Amino acid sequence: VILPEGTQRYVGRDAQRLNILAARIIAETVRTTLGPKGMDKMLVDSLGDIVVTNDCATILDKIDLQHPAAKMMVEVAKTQDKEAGDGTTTAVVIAGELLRKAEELLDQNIHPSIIIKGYALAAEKAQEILDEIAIRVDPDDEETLLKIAATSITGKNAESHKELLAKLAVEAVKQVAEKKDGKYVVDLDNIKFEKKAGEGVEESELVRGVVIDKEVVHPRMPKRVENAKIALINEALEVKKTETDAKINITSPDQLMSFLEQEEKMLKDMVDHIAQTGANVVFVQKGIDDLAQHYLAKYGIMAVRRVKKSDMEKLAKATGAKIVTNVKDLTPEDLGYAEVVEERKLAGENMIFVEGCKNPKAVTILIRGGTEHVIDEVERALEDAVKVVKDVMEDGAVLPAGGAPEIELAIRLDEYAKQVGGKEALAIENFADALKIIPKTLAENAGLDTVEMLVKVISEHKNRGLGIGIDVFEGKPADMLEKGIIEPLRVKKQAIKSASEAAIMILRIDDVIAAKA
Amino acid sequence: VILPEGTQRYVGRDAQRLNILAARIIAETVRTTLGPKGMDKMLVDSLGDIVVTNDCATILDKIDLQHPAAKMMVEVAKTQDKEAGDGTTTAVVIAGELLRKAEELLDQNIHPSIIIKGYALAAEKAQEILDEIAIRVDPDDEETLLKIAATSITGKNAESHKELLAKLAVEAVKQVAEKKDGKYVVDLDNIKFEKKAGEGVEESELVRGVVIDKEVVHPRMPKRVENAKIALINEALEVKKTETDAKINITSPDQLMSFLEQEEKMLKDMVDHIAQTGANVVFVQKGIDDLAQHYLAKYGIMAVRRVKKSDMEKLAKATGAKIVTNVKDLTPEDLGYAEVVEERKLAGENMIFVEGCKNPKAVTILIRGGTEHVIDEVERALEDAVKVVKDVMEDGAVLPAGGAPEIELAIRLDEYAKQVGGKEALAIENFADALKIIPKTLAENAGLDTVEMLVKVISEHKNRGLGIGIDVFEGKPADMLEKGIIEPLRVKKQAIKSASEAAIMILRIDDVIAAKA
Amino acid sequence: VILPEGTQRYVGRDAQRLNILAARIIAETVRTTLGPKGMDKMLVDSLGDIVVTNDCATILDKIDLQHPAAKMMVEVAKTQDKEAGDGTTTAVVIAGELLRKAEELLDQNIHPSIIIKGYALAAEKAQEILDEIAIRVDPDDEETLLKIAATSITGKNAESHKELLAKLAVEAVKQVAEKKDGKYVVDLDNIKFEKKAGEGVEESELVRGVVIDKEVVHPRMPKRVENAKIALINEALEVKKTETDAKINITSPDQLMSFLEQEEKMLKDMVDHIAQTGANVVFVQKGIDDLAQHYLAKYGIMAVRRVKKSDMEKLAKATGAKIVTNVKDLTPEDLGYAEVVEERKLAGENMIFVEGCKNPKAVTILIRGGTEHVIDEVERALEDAVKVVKDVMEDGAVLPAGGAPEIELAIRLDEYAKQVGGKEALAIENFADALKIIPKTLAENAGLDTVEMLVKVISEHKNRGLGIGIDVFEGKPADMLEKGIIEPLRVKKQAIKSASEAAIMILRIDDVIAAKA
Ligand SMILES: Nc1ncnc2c1ncn2[C@@H]1O[C@H](COP(=O)(O)OP(=O)(O)O)[C@@H](O)[C@H]1O
Ligand SMILES: Nc1ncnc2c1ncn2[C@@H]1O[C@H](COP(=O)(O)OP(=O)(O)O)[C@@H](O)[C@H]1O
Ligand SMILES: Nc1ncnc2c1ncn2[C@@H]1O[C@H](COP(=O)(O)OP(=O)(O)O)[C@@H](O)[C@H]1O
Ligand SMILES: [Mg+2]
Ligand SMILES: [Mg+2]
Ligand SMILES: [Mg+2]
Known part of the structure; x- marks a missing residue:
């Protein structure tokens, strides 16, 4: 047609x-x-x-x-x-x-x-x-920076605690904020928000560290470490295999054992590599075999597996640790610091709090509230609150x-x-x-x-x-x-x-x- | 539009x-x-x-x-x-x-x-x-806590026995209730409810241990153990295999036998690591080969397999036993104590009672009742009962x-x-x-x-x-x-x-x- | 019928x-x-x-x-x-x-x-x-070439900045321009447009080099090189395999380690060939194994993987580097120069800027604008401004x-x-x-x-x-x-x-x- x-x-x-x-x-x-x-x-x-x-x-x-x-x-x-x-x-x-x-x-x-x-x-x-x-x-005049943030929140549902939330937003931005050229530059991706139901919006706080929704991978590992020396490993703590197709041909009995032991060894050697650096806390991005979980446990090292790549980077910016692809090359200078790394059960859920970091370049704001709705709206309020603070610091x-x-x-x-x-x-x-x-x-x-x-x-x-x-x-x-x-x-x-x-x-x-x- | x-x-x-x-x-x-x-x-x-x-x-x-x-x-x-x-x-x-x-x-x-x-x-x-x-x-006034619990049960169907239930509820929360910083803190997750039809709501009781819905895995094993030394193993009692693919190439007749024996040994060696600790009761989270079962039976040890992770964690808290991943590192200090561990046929269903534990940090409330509905509603009554008792101990x-x-x-x-x-x-x-x-x-x-x-x-x-x-x-x-x-x-x-x-x-x-x- | x-x-x-x-x-x-x-x-x-x-x-x-x-x-x-x-x-x-x-x-x-x-x-x-x-x-009269371009942009949307766009359009074609036979000949494929939402159209600019939408492959690699010596490799930096079907047969424990080490070497050898040329920046068309990335990182080399064939060629022309199929034959003569090669985050997006090139035979125009639409239309305007400035130089x-x-x-x-x-x-x-x-x-x-x-x-x-x-x-x-x-x-x-x-x-x-x- x-x-x-x-x-x-x-x-x-x-x-x-x-x-x-x-x-x-x-x-x-x-x-x-x-x-x-x-x-x-x-x-x-x-x-x-x-x-x-x-x-x-x-x-x-x-x-x-x-x-x-x-x-x-x-x-x-x-x-x-x-x-x-x-x-x-x-x-x-x-x-x-x-x-x-x-x-x-x-x-x-x-x-x-x-x-x-x-x-x-x-x-x-x-x-x-x-x-x-x-x-x-003045770019950092905390006075007006507190006003901007507050005025913003007073425009939504959550104006109920405009006082607290404004403060958390100015504090959060001032921390991650960067300035090496004369003026500030804020990458808001460096401010994670953690929403957990229960409590009141009153219990919301700034965590100069990071919060991760994972558990300690082994029963026998510390559920809390005091002055943590953190290791961010992005390699699988498991029995490596060759890129070239390969298979084992057991020909005599004694081999069933010798081989298994050969892998335990490989496994244990990886773990040993992590311990020798003095690291008591390890966040692994990939998986973690059971034996390797066991050796790590025996050394009194707290380990978490399958960490979101986004989490690894937040951990890196917060603790000062360096993400590593090869355990073999891990050194103490790669390890990061956290004043306390503990597994707490918040609202029935287990989470890992990496708080008290040195001079975090990435921070987290824990949001608390009665219902899902109260939470979601507070996060929204805060994101705007944070974004306006970012503007005034860069614009002045x-x-x-x-x-x-x-x-x-x-x-x-x-x-x-x-x-x-x-x-x-x-x-x-x-x-x-x-x-x-x-x-x-x-x-x-x-x-x-x-x-x-x-x-x-x-x-x-x-x-x-x-x-x-x-x-x-x-x-x-x-x-x-x-x-x-x-x-x-x-x-x-x-x-x-x-x-x-x-x-x-x-x-x-x-x-x-x-x-x- | x-x-x-x-x-x-x-x-x-x-x-x-x-x-x-x-x-x-x-x-x-x-x-x-x-x-x-x-x-x-x-x-x-x-x-x-x-x-x-x-x-x-x-x-x-x-x-x-x-x-x-x-x-x-x-x-x-x-x-x-x-x-x-x-x-x-x-x-x-x-x-x-x-x-x-x-x-x-x-x-x-x-x-x-x-x-x-x-x-x-x-x-x-x-x-x-x-x-x-x-x-x-007063945060622990047995008196008012017994009331709070009863006033609660009386609002529901179950008030016919507001008496018993209120007692079981105050008793149960006081046991798992944890305090060491001045005020109480109750993690009601440490209180498991077990519902079984038959009998009267009257037979409901507080087991100062844990009840598990599993059976003794082997015919010849002990169905009852006085003063049990309990082991919590979260590893499979079966022939381990290598991560790296592998297969056996039998080359001569004498190989069939020798290879099987080599596995019996691997199995028995694991059972031996368990027996040598003194443990006469083993709860394994994963499975148990038929031979490992047999050896376990010969040492007069009572074992159960495929135990729920939630159960293991309760036995762990209730008996003071520690969960282990490697039988090679199970020491007698990892064992826990239970006055009596017995398999009773409660209402045609076999179950395992771990009772008379030392000081439980987890405890079970067994619920009896004529119909499925009587049971469910009593549990619902008990739940609000336990939850209000938790309120006063924390609030006062x-x-x-x-x-x-x-x-x-x-x-x-x-x-x-x-x-x-x-x-x-x-x-x-x-x-x-x-x-x-x-x-x-x-x-x-x-x-x-x-x-x-x-x-x-x-x-x-x-x-x-x-x-x-x-x-x-x-x-x-x-x-x-x-x-x-x-x-x-x-x-x-x-x-x-x-x-x-x-x-x-x-x-x-x-x-x-x-x-x- | x-x-x-x-x-x-x-x-x-x-x-x-x-x-x-x-x-x-x-x-x-x-x-x-x-x-x-x-x-x-x-x-x-x-x-x-x-x-x-x-x-x-x-x-x-x-x-x-x-x-x-x-x-x-x-x-x-x-x-x-x-x-x-x-x-x-x-x-x-x-x-x-x-x-x-x-x-x-x-x-x-x-x-x-x-x-x-x-x-x-x-x-x-x-x-x-x-x-x-x-x-x-005059085939290259700067005056008229700016007119022809500004006149073309006026007839469209973005004529609100006919000023800037006109300039970028003339520069862009003069640079990539080729004229050895007397008169010019412009292959507009040598001008790449890059659209990124955000900013004003004011921030649009000419990048005497190339802009790639990839990031640095490893966390430990430099996110910025000063006087890059770029290497263009169209070979997979990973464990090669024979065309004829093959499979490793492990027959003793030590083998599990010797074989992995054999491949490590292979991988390390390729990276060695790349480093022995003095290359501090490598763009690889195919993939890069995990270890190859680690060695590359240690040497302080910045590597990017899976780069688009179309991008490889624009880099070859922008830097003067020569694409290579076999790392074994890479020499310092195959490398190109870039006054600065850095990974920047533009619109929460990670991109690599190969700018400051010598005499780029390929160049990139970065388009900035409020909405997705503002950008698409500015690009359209430029494609005409560039296509007309092309006619004048070839026709005069x-x-x-x-x-x-x-x-x-x-x-x-x-x-x-x-x-x-x-x-x-x-x-x-x-x-x-x-x-x-x-x-x-x-x-x-x-x-x-x-x-x-x-x-x-x-x-x-x-x-x-x-x-x-x-x-x-x-x-x-x-x-x-x-x-x-x-x-x-x-x-x-x-x-x-x-x-x-x-x-x-x-x-x-x-x-x-x-x-x-
Ligand atoms: N105390 C106030 N009295 C009157 N207007 C206010 C006050 N505080 C903020 N506003 C105005 O309300 C508007 C913001 O309202 P809001 O619901 O948050 O929408 P928006 O997405 O535009 O911020 C702005 O114009 C602002 O100046
Ligand atoms: N003996 C009583 N006499 C009058 N009111 C009572 C008595 N016991 C409980 N209530 C009241 O009944 C209400 C609880 O009833 P219930 O059916 O359990 O609902 P809810 O979910 O609110 O607990 C409370 O307001 C309480 O004060
Ligand atoms: N300042 C101007 N005044 C009148 N006409 C103009 C002016 N600038 C360009 N034109 C004319 O507008 C036409 C190009 O308009 P445009 O919308 O881009 O369509 P086209 O697809 O034909 O390029 C040409 O005929 C050109 O001469
Ligand atoms: Mg607003
Ligand atoms: Mg009620
Ligand atoms: Mg036109």
């Missing part, structure tokens, strides 16, 4: 109209969760699985989106989460608004070309205004929260509009207005009076200054800086990038061709 | 309304089993299996719940059972009730935000008041029963309401009123006049003091302390935690998105 | 009329993307996968065309992309327009023969006019853009129409009119007044000259030469070639016989 049936297509009005609608729908689905007073969502997976969260990234991800334009909104939160960690709801909400105000300009008959260009100018000029209004802080700049920056951008980006003038100025002014859904939906989710409230905020801000935003807890405008309610300068800069590009990318699609599914 | 067809979604009122309804429905399904006079449910699964219990946890679990919000109730009972072991029905009922009174506040148009904050202040203040009014008892605090803690919580929490004031006060007052479903549904299941009866109890309590609660056996208020009817301070502190958490979790969800169920 | 059932057929009018319709349809589909102001399309394939692009080649290829004649319009962009690399839209648009004005002549009863012939003449004469009017430039002849060349071919080709006269004159006249969709649909996509604009231009061009065309950013005619807005003389020559070729191909089909479509 001509073009496959059960294949739809839209152009101009249609195309853009549908795309903007789908985009806006998704955006409004999450805006109900923006801020400290935002709500939660219960996502019921087809397999019966239940996820209750405040996280935009998680929601957009779990929800099965069909419309293409809506899936693109997932990329917004996806990029925001991977660049600033926090503000995923914000980026998607602003992208939807930008598209709503944009369609308005389309209805007015303004060429997409003009809207796009005016949006780009507004987007580019916002980065500029933010880089400018940003409050340059912060901003007030509660829509204070978008209000600055609105008020200001409208002047830029005048200067630009023309059709573009229309897009620029609309862009500046779209930016108000943050202060707006913040006061809305809080039960406040959207209309009236949004008037006081722009009032104060115009008077008092850059620090004026809305405090959902106060129910009125306030100086966010004096209240220590702040956020990373990177989180805002990135929301604007993510949203404006998602907006412009849609304002550019004049034809949609979807086949049959 | 944002979502796939066949996907349902609800928002605002709908969401909450349905969640609360599904929660309340499940709650009312179990409330009929609350207290001593509670009723039992019969659960028939698709496979035809029939379960008859009073236990909330089993019911919420066996029943196939589908609505999401209703499953989040299963979690409440799960957390409760994993923390205080008892009060599962109580936590679930107070959750459904907390939500019902919560919706009433929603109907009045009170922002969910307000209800959540007020419910949190109520839950927080409730803990505080419980910590206070808590009757601090108790409270009166019959909803007396809640009546006190109600009266007191309400005052708190006044001082807090505002809309929160409406939430607090309601939270407090919700707690009354315990006394309420206790009198109800009993068959008493709820309305009237609940007026009396709140009266007595206001006068006579914190110990006044309802006594379903008295049909009137009573001083629960003088009656000896009490429960762990943990059970109540945990009910409030669980229920209030769940109530708030659900009160936060303003959107539900589901696929296939 | 005669012909298979469900087999359609068309003749004369039908056949030709349908084919021309199908062809025109596809053409009108892509024309909305032509030029700087062209719009993008959203393509959702059967598996939900989303492709958002401006590229014609991609759109015709992703869309599932069913009609035969429309599938042939794909070959047009296919051929165009393969010979000039740019103007794929231009070629398809002109080919449909050609087929339109051609049907007019068919309706007029002019025999297909006359149209084909007059079209072939209009095409032959078209090249002639181009080769002539062509603005001959540019042209003005903005339809300037087509307007010139139109005016001119009409004269030719006169002198040829007769029926063919009508075909040559219509062919020259067809070439106007370019200036037409450029002004249209821009949102200008087609009719009116197309007149100011045919005018200005007539009075000012060859360099007059439409400037979509200017919204009016302009001298494309003064604006630097130009394109390869090859792009235009191949467009005409491709279009007319196709148009005539369809005009010659008077019967279509299909089985199922």
Whole structure:
């Protein structure tokens, strides 16, 4: 035939109209969760699985989106989460608004070309205004580093212990953080999270070491070692075989024995190699024969087998040990140190705690809570908390929260509009207005009076200054800086990038061709 | 088309309304089993299996719940059972009730935000008041521990012998109970239950050792050993083979014989290493060749094979014996002591009793009973019995029963309401009123006049003091302390935690998105 | 019967009329993307996968065309992309327009023969006019080469950084460029693109070397070499085996050790051959045994395994190293140089950067961007920018853009129409009119007044000259030469070639016989 049936297509009005609608729908689905007073969502997976969260990234991800334009909104939160960690709801909400105000300009008959260009100018000029209004802080000033982390957690379910969790996140990042060129550089892969049900979120702690979900491989091995000299062996403590096909031909009785003894020997020799270094704790990545388990036990050496490769590396960065491929070449300089390596039964499960490490380059945060749900959400809260701390340490700049920056951008980006003038100025002014859904939906989710409230905020801000935003807890405008309610300068800069590009990318699609599914 | 067809979604009122309804429905399904006079449910699964219990946890679990919000109730009972072991029905009922009174506040148009904050202040203040009014008892007062256990057994079917069971339970937990740092620590995993049909629940006893469902592996071995020196071998008593592939090449007739003999020897040598330690009782985790069996029999040693790893660990803890991987290194110091080790044919089934151990660190409770159901339910009773005894030894605090803690919580929490004031006060007052479903549904299941009866109890309590609660056996208020009817301070502190958490979790969800169920 | 059932057929009018319709349809589909102001399309394939692009080649290829004649319009962009690399839209648009004005002549009863012939003449004469009017430039003029590239990128998405991309594109081709026979010859296979999400498009860069998506094979190997002496081994660094079937037969215990040691040596000997050359970095196409890795690690050599054949060759060309099949013959002369070979983590991804090379005959462009889409589209832009800069260096002849060349071919080709006269004159006249969709649909996509604009231009061009065309950013005619807005003389020559070729191909089909479509 001509073009496959059960294949739809839209152009101009249609195309853009549908795309903007789908985009806006998704955006409004999450805006109900923006801020400290935002709500939660219960996502019921087809397999019966239940996820209750405040996280935009998680929601957009779990929800099965069909419309293409809506899936693109997932990329917004996806990029925001991977660049600033926090503000995923914000980026998607602003992208939807930008598209709503944009369609308005389309209805007015303004060429997409003009809207796009005016949006780009507004987007580019916002980065500029933010880089400018940003409050340059001291990279490790623990004071504000504690605020950033806290402000972040106060936006989710777990704000109940914003105090503790903030502290654990600033402490965790400060430890693994690296600086050898002048500024910091944080590899968050160096902060493992351990979630165990039971207890309260109160019992959550920072383990300047590592936690592994394995047991001590032999009954007779120490279930605890004091000042451990740790060995990370990535070789199988078992009877090696030749790459070349080989088989034994027993020809006389005495051989059954001689051979077995020959292997015990090989086995024991490997173990001996490990002991001679003075190592009392060994984490093996591959397997461990039974005899080798026995010899290791007799030397009073604690051994764990089948360790995840990801675990081995965490152990390496935490204890200072060096992973080794050949036991024969293992030396004491390869061994790492842990103030205590013990096997504890946490919530019925046995785990190995490698704590009290020297100056760990990798750390673990043990999360405790009543239910699976409480745990999962706290991990989420923390990941954002950690990610914002990472931003402030690398950037060294912060901003007030509660829509204070978008209000600055609105008020200001409208002047830029005048200067630009023309059709573009229309897009620029609309862009500046779209930016108000943050202060707006913040006061809305809080039960406040959207209309009236949004008037006081722009009032104060115009008077008092850059620090004026809305405090959902106060129910009125306030100086966010004096209240220590702040956020990373990177989180805002990135929301604007993510949203404006998602907006412009849609304002550019004049034809949609979807086949049959 | 944002979502796939066949996907349902609800928002605002709908969401909450349905969640609360599904929660309340499940709650009312179990409330009929609350207290001593509670009723039992019969659960028939698709496979035809029939379960008859009073236990909330089993019911919420066996029943196939589908609505999401209703499953989040299963979690409440799960957390409760994993923390205080008892009060599962109580936590679930107070959750459904907390939500019902919560919706009433929603109907009045009170922002969910307000209800959540007020419910949190109520839950927080409730803990505080419980910590206070808590009757601090002596961590090992045989007296109150015998009570806590009995008050518990009386709530279920098994109260006919609340006498025996409560004794077996306090006795059993005291034996395995471990302390050496000041306070007790109980690992209930060191208490195994053994259920056997026949006889009367009366024949249930505490074996200060371990019962194993295996038989003496050889005909000619001893079926009974006085003062046994016990060996725990976790190695196979069979012809070892090399890791490296190998095969025998018989070249001459005289080889057939000599090779077999060479294996008999290997076998006998292993048996010899065991006999030379003095051990007359061997429990092997793996298998035992037929010859190793024969040699073991000649030395008059009693052996059992294929012993469960969980069993080995118990015999190890119960007899002081150490588990060995190599028979070559078994010393007499690895052996353990059991006053008597005998194979008894308990109800047509052969089993092995290791009794009269020195000081057990693990102990078994043998359960007898007419039917399979009698047995199962008694075990369930015992489990909550052992779990509450564990609570007091670790906590050292108790409270009166019959909803007396809640009546006190109600009266007191309400005052708190006044001082807090505002809309929160409406939430607090309601939270407090919700707690009354315990006394309420206790009198109800009993068959008493709820309305009237609940007026009396709140009266007595206001006068006579914190110990006044309802006594379903008295049909009137009573001083629960003088009656000896009490429960762990943990059970109540945990009910409030669980229920209030769940109530708030659900009160936060303003959107539900589901696929296939 | 005669012909298979469900087999359609068309003749004369039908056949030709349908084919021309199908062809025109596809053409009108892509024309909305032509030029700087062209719009993008959203393509959702059967598996939900989303492709958002401006590229014609991609759109015709992703869309599932069913009609035969429309599938042939794909070959047009296919051929165009393969010979000039740019103007794929231009070629398809002109080919449909050609087929339109051609049907007019068919309706007029002019025999297909006359149209084909007059079209072939209009095409032959078209090249002639181009080769002539062509603005001959210096094969390596840095100036114009930057223009040709920036002009190409402007017509797409990433024109927001036309600046940078232009630069990288010129450098990249100059480097890999080969010219010993007088003029240049560029093998674009020597330019590899590397896409990694994250950062801005600002961070995109040129890597005078290669970038490989592999990591260092052993934990103990250097993660960075300063003045690498790279070795390229296409041999498996593992225990070799005889082609003839073989198997070791162990006949005594000492053998288990002697045989493993024999293989260790073999392995160690290969690594010795690699080290004895002074090579501190080795890339191996096949695998590397575990021991071979250990020796390699001890010697302080950085090794990578399983490297792509395509990568090996890019390294050979980037470093000057020679690939080797037998380590035994590796010499220091087979090694290459790299100012730095380091393993970096880009987007949580581990990659090896062989940068700083001497005179790389192969080079890599690293593409950075917010979303997956941003990147894929920037790569597309670069492939065109690089393919056009390739044409200019090999051809050394540019042209003005903005339809300037087509307007010139139109005016001119009409004269030719006169002198040829007769029926063919009508075909040559219509062919020259067809070439106007370019200036037409450029002004249209821009949102200008087609009719009116197309007149100011045919005018200005007539009075000012060859360099007059439409400037979509200017919204009016302009001298494309003064604006630097130009394109390869090859792009235009191949467009005409491709279009007319196709148009005539369809005009010659008077019967279509299909089985199922
Ligand atoms: N105390 C506060 N009062 C009002 N708004 C706040 C307060 N704290 C944080 N916010 C705002 O709430 C938003 C973050 O809400 P959240 O639910 O976490 O979504 P997101 O994914 O965008 O971080 C930010 O705009 C932030 O400024
Ligand atoms: N003799 C009694 N008189 C009145 N109430 C009692 C008595 N014994 C126990 N209760 C109450 O019954 C409740 C426990 O009932 P039960 O069916 O076992 O459910 P749960 O899972 O909550 O333990 C507790 O609130 C407790 O105070
Ligand atoms: N600044 C400009 N103003 C008007 N037309 C331009 C400009 N730059 C390039 N063009 C034209 O746009 C066309 C290329 O647009 P493009 O979208 O890349 O499609 P194609 O596949 O034909 O390259 C060419 O005809 C070219 O002359
Ligand atoms: Mg957040
Ligand atoms: Mg009970
Ligand atoms: Mg182009």
